[PDB]
Amino acid sequence: KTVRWCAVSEHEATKCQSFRDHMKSVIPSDGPSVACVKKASYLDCIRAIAANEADAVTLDAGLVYDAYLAPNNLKPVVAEFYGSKEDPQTFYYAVAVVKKDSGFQMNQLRGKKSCHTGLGRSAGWNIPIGLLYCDLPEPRKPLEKAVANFFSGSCAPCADGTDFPQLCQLCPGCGCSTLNQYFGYSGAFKCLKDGAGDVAFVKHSTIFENLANKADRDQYELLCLDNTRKPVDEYKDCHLAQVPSHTVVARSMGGKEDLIWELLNQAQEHFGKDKSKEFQLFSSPHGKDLLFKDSAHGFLKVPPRMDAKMYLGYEYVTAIRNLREGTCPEAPTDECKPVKWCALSHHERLKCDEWSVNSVGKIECVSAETTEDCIAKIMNGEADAMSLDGGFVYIAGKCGLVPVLAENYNKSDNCEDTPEAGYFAIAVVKKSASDLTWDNLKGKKSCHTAVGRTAGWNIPMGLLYNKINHCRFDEFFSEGCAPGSKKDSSLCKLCMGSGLNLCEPNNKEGYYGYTGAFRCLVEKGDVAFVKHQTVPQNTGGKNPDPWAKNLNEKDYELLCLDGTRKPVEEYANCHLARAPNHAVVTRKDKEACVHKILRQQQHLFGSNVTDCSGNFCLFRSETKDLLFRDDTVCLAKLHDRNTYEKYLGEEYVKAVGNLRKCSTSSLLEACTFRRP
Ligand SMILES: *[C@@H]1O[C@H](CO)[C@@H](O[C@@H]2O[C@H](CO)[C@@H](O)[C@H](O)[C@H]2NC(C)=O)[C@H](O)[C@H]1NC(C)=O
Ligand SMILES: [Mg+2]
């Protein structure tokens, strides 16, 4: 139970050894211990960790990436944080500050005038130039000269003035000290404030540190990667890169990550920010920033399904990858790159393969084990598009992806130009039970289409989470019928399935499905969770079955969240959530291409086509609902709804989130770690 920490200096090793001793005192024989391995450099520490001679070292984003690469393959496991638990600030943001209404975007920086914090600085140079690399003119080695030919004039502190003078044009001599008024963060910002430069590459924090009044900040904007702008307040939605300020790494396989976290968590409990004055984890007696930055206020456990690329973010890896590999294609700037679609089953891959050949190369295919792994592929560029249900549209939204096309299921003349927004989830009750409203629901008897289902379970129980705030969903209702629950649960007591079918989510349960839950309402329930048309189609002699011949709509009302009851036809105003259609999800920087390609694609192999055997067709599956749901007639454009929050109702998001507090998704907890 020992963590072998790696030092990169004699002073660091000394701090590690006193950390070992102090951890010795307070900790029982069982549990964390510290070993102090000492190597010559961060690179050497990485190669030692990979070679199982050390276990943990804490690194700057660049070395995080270095450690990620073959043959080391280390991963982030714990993260220093630089404020409070309520506002960690484990990351910072590299941004491009500009004058308000200066009239240009990220893809128009050529010819403009630049202000950098310093050459080799991450936010001031590495990140922006990395992203801009391919826009630099062809003799891209040496980099300083290509940057010089890119901008008309620059201040690039610490650059080689004598050889590349345009980089000192705004700060002649390129002083690498505060002597140069345009050096550093405050200097790169004053370079812009003084109108010397058109753009300043700095950190999110910098505008706030140099301008106290909101008034003056309001004449500054930020360049976003999508070639829009935003106010400086909104850097979390308009940054060049998000960068983890200081990250502990361990081996991927066999890394002891849990030991590292146990150890550091206890260490911060005993010797952290101020809670002891004998020894301070975040204070170097012999140097500065030994083992850990002295800014740090504490540690946070990194979610277990984070890999380096996911942690750093696609922008950052683009930046370093460009600056190290230095490979730009010659592909024509305007044309779209073939969209690689993500398959999660053997038959999904076979369908996508046929599609690819018939797409004459416009579509390609990428297999991945699971849905979440596919989403990961979209985020990090290994894949471009896939179709998701509501819940995964939400997880992908929290991961920065966007919906772009909705699967439309209702045939119509011009369905490409009208998305559908889905059916309505409702909570039905019988008028004969007058005192029932959304609030007293607790302790009453209930009927669900089936556990897992969207209208029968997810939306209702998600909205009710707030009236319970724990994950024992069978304790809200006295008794119920929720097919799929465990048989000895109270949510199985009212199910009427015979033999082995008693509580099984299948037709033989008979209180299963929309019809079945409504039957459970009329026969033995107080409330039943279904969609808007279930009552109209099981009443008035529309259902011939014995129980359902003579029931009439008037007898039932449906429960509204405001605490009032409403009639069935008024579902549009009385509903719990809007149960959404499947939607094609992609990364923002590919939204356009996807839009275009898919549309072309659904003209050919789309529902219009007969002789589906003589030619390929995109919405017919050999098995069931491969790639797209087989109901799809078209893919409808999501103008004005191209964000997970907009595409999914406010109510639906409330419900799915609340649920996800009980059913964790490792991907979702990673993504929320990077963006709360
Ligand atoms: C439902 O079916 C048709 C599409 O073929 C459309 O129904 C329309 O409903 C509105 C409101 O009741 C009427 O005013 C229109 O006259 C109907 N049109 C037709 C053709 O029936 C509607 O577009 C479809 N709904 C969805 C979501 O696609
Ligand atoms: Mg001591």
Residue numbers in the entry: 4 to 679
Share the article's original sentences:
Human serum transferrin (Tf), also known as serotransferrin, is a ~80 kDa glycoprotein that transits blood plasma, whose function is to maintain iron homeostasis by transporting iron from its absorption site to every cell through the blood vessels. Its structure consists of two homologous lobes, an N-terminal lobe and a C-terminal lobe, each subdivided into two domains, in between which a metal-binding site is found, thus allowing Tf to bind two ferric ions per molecule. The transferrin completes a cycle in which it transits the bloodstream as holo-Tf (iron-loaded form) and binds to the transferrin receptor (TfR) expressed on endothelial cells. The Tf–TfR complex formed is internalized in endosomes, where the pH is more acidic (5.5) than in the bloodstream (7.4); it is suggested that this pH decrease promotes a conformational change that induces iron release from the metal-binding site of transferrin.
After exploring a plethora of strategies, a crystallographic model of apo-Tf has been constructed from X-ray diffraction data from one of the best crystals grown under the conventional vapor-diffusion technique. A crystallographic model of glycosylated apo-Tf was obtained at 3.0 Å resolution, which did not resolve further despite many efforts to improve crystal quality. The data for our apo-Tf model are good enough for visualizing the general protein structure, allowing the location of two NAG moieties bound to residue Asn413. Some extra density could be observed after the second NAG element, which points to a potential elongation of the glycosyl chain that could be the key factor hampering crystal quality improvement. As has been reviewed, glycosylation does not necessarily prevent crystallization—it may even help—but the resolution limit and diffraction quality may suffer. We can conclude that the glycosylation is perhaps the main reason that all the efforts to improve crystal quality were not successful, along with the high flexibility of the structure, as shown in the SAXS experiments in the solution. However, the resolution is still limited in its ability to provide insight into the functional details. In the solution, apo-Tf remained mostly globular in all the pH conditions tested; however, the co-existence of closed, partially open, and open conformations was observed for holo-Tf, which showed a more elongated and flexible shape overall. We did not observe any conformational changes for the apo form. Indeed, 90% of the available conformations are populated by the “closed” conformation, corresponding to the initial model.
